[PDB]
Structure formats: C-alpha cells, structure tokens
Amino acid sequence: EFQVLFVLTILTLISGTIFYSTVEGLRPIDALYFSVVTLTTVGETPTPQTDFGKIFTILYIFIGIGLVFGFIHKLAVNVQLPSILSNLVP
Amino acid sequence: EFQVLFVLTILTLISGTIFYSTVEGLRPIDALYFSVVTLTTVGETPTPQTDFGKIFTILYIFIGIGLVFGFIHKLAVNVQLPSILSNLVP
Amino acid sequence: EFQVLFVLTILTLISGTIFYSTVEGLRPIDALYFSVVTLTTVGETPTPQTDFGKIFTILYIFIGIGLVFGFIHKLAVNVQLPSILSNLVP
Amino acid sequence: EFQVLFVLTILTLISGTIFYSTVEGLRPIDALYFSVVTLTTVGETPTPQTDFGKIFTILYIFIGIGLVFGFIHKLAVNVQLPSILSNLVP
Ligand SMILES: [Ba+2]
Ligand SMILES: [K+]
Ligand SMILES: [K+]
Ligand SMILES: [K+]
C-alpha cells in the first residue's frame, strides 16, 4: 500500500528529473526540486523556458498531483499518525 | 462523470487561455500555463500586470479550483487507481 | 451556510487588503491579489518586504486557509455541482 | 488533539527556521516565512540556493505537509467552526 505509492512517486519524480535536466537543461538537483515543488503544488521554480517544458509541466501536474498527495496522505495517516498515536500512550 | 469533469476543465482552461493572451498579451502557451498552475494552486507565473488581469485571476481562482481538483480527484481515483489496483493482481 | 462562508471570506479578504495596502504600501488591488493567492495557496506575490508583513502573512495563512477552502468546497459542491448535475438532466 | 498537532507544527517550523537561517544564511524571520509558505503549499521564497537547501526542502515538504494540513484542518473544524457555529445561535 504505502510501498506502492512510494515506488510510484519515486518513478514519477525520476521521470520529471530526467525531463527537466534534458529539455530545460537544469542540473539534476534543480530538475528534481522543480518536479517536487510542482507536484506538491508548492511552487514552480525555475519556470520552464521552452514550450516543450511548459506543455510537459501542464500534463505532469494533472497526472502527478493525485499520486503525490495520495502518498503524502498515507505517509501521514498510516505512518506518521501511528508513530505519534502509539507514542502518546503512557 | 469523468468525461463531464474533463470537458468542464478543458472549457475553463480555454477560457483562461483566451483571457490572458488577450488582456495580458501572453503567447497562448504561456496563457494556458498560467491558467493551469493557477487553478491547480501550483503557482502564478507570469503574475498579471493589469488590474483587469488581477481581478479576473481572483474570480478565476475561486470558480475554477473546485472544478479542477474534482477532475484530478476522479482522474486519480476512478482512472489511475483502477489501472494500478487491477494491475497489481498477479 | 454558503452565505455565512461567503461573508466570512469577504471579511477576511478585506482585512488582508487593508493590511497590505497599509503596511506593505501596496495599491488596494495588489493587496487583494496577494491576500487571495495566499489564502488559496496559489502563491505569494509580491512577497512582503517588512518583518511585520511577513509575520502577519504567517498568521494570516494559518487562520484563513481553512475558511477559504471551506467556501470553495461548498461553492463547488452546494452551488456548482447542482447547477451542472440538474442541467445534465435531459 | 489540537494541542498535539499545535506542538508538532511549532517544532517542525522551528526546525525549518534553524535550518534555513544556518544553511541558506537567512534572517530568522525569512527562514520561518520560507518554512511556513512551503509547508502550507503557498509558495517557496526565497528559493534555496545551495544543493543542501534544495535537498532538505524536498524532504521537509514531504514530511511536513501532512502535519501542517492536519493542524489547519482541526484548527478550522474543531476550533473555528464551533466559535462561529455556536455564535450563529440567536
Ligand atoms: Ba503554490
Ligand atoms: K498549493
Ligand atoms: K508559488
Ligand atoms: K514565484
């Protein structure tokens, strides 16, 4: 469950990292940063400069946001909550 | 269901694209990019320069965010989940 | 219900507009734009330049996001959905 | 309940504030501002300039967003709603 979402998220981020480092010519870490802030809806820096980068970002957002938030949702409810919930027991 | 939300989203994005390319004078792809990152709450680049663009963006956000996330929600739960859920069956 | 959330949202946005136009010295429309993109989590332009503006924004976000999304949620489910739901009936 | 989420959020923000003021060399208030807009998904200003800042931000986002929104969710439903719900009684 959490494992599946984790793998799917990693694969999605790797895909984004490869795309932006290639098409937008970003250093890998910046490409990964862009992929992460975009899919978590935090932001979009550096904004794509090529039409290909803009088109891909549009599609990337619509397809990846759902996955990313599903992962964060389960990561917090099925992994972060129990660790604090149980740890709150005297 | 998913089809309806898809059509409504496309129409909303087209409307945004037409507005920003006209009033803010953006190239269509940039107008579409702005419309997408705004409604998905990712960001807002390039920020509108005219008061008309700012007013429209305010109204655009309040009316479109709900629709856009409904689409992403169903796109992920009623289309992305089944494809992975069923595909996870040996 | 929807009316209450609407009034609360308007009051919250007016408060933000007054604050930023005064402390950050922004033109009212820009102060309102900032208040809207911040509470909808879309963005934050122009970023506050004074420590007072930064502190207020921090508190503004935590107190207003919940309200704003409650309004958008009901605006879409109890107002946008019915109009399309019923209109989808031959 | 609300108290626990409040404490966890404060601790998370303090951690972010310390990190960015140290590694990114930001004034504390700017480090706190960055930590807040990032975890609430509002934005990311100023964008990290060091690879360490970018890596930390990526991890910070995934681990903190869930917590932050849980707090805002309860702050609005279990604290803001009752105050308006009960206050709406003649
Ligand atoms: Ba954002
Ligand atoms: K957001
Ligand atoms: K942003
Ligand atoms: K920005």
Query: For residues B44 and B65, what is the distance between their CA atoms, to the nearest angstrom?
Result: 13
Helices (H), D40-80: 51-75
The helix or strand, by DSSP H or E, that contains position D38, with its residue range, turns out to be helix D28-39
Encoded amino acid at C74, one letter? K
Six-digit token string for B15: 């409307």
Query: For residues C43 and C48, what is the distance between their CA atoms, to the nearest angstrom?
Result: 12
Residue in chain B closest to C46 (alpha carbons) equals B47
C30-57 b/e with 16+ CB inside 10 Å = b? bbbbbbbbbbbbbbbbebbeeeebbebb
From the list C41, A80, B45, the residue with the least C-alpha distance to D64 is A80
Interface contact C66-D84, CB threshold 8 A: no
Give the Cα-Cα-Cα angle A24, A25, A28 (nearest 5 degrees): 105
The helix or strand, by DSSP H or E, that contains position C67, with its residue range, turns out to be helix C51-75
Six-digit token string for B54: 């700012």
How close does chain A come to B81, measured CA to CA in Å?
A: 9
Query: For residues C66 and B62, what is the distance between their CA atoms, to the nearest angstrom?
Result: 14
B8 touches C: beta carbon within 8 Å: yes
Is the Cβ–Cβ distance between B65 and B41 less than 8 Å?
yes
Which residue in the set D32, D36, D76 is minimally distant from C66, CB to CB? D76
Query: For residues B78 and B90, what is the distance between their CA atoms, to the nearest angstrom?
Result: 21
Give the Cα-Cα-Cα angle A32, A38, A41 (nearest 5 degrees): 140
How close does chain B come to C76, measured CA to CA in Å?
A: 6
Question: Which residues have a C–N gap over 2.5 Å right after them in chain C?
Answer: none
Which domains, ranges and CATH numbers included, belong to chain A? 1-90 (1.10.287.70)
Query: For residues B56 and B82, what is the distance between their CA atoms, to the nearest angstrom?
Result: 37
Query: For residues D59 and D75, what is the distance between their CA atoms, to the nearest angstrom?
Result: 25
In total, the C-beta contacts within 8 angstroms joining chain B to chain C are 52
Query: For residues B83 and C49, what is the distance between their CA atoms, to the nearest angstrom?
Result: 48
Name all chains with 3 or more CB-CB pairs below 8 Å to chain D. Answer: A, C
Query: For residues B61 and A72, what is the distance between their CA atoms, to the nearest angstrom?
Result: 24
Query: For residues D18 and D23, what is the distance between their CA atoms, to the nearest angstrom?
Result: 9
Q: What is the largest CA-CA distance in chain A?
A: 57
DSSP string covering B26-38: --HHHHHHHHHHH
Which residue in the set A29, A41, A80 is minimally distant from D41, CB to CB? A41
Which residue in the set B36, B41, B88 is minimally distant from A4, CB to CB? B88
**Residues with Cβ < 8 Å from C85, sequence gap 6 or more?**
none
In chain A, residues with a C-beta closer than 8 Å to the C-beta of B30 are 54
With tokens 């940039």, the residue in question is B30
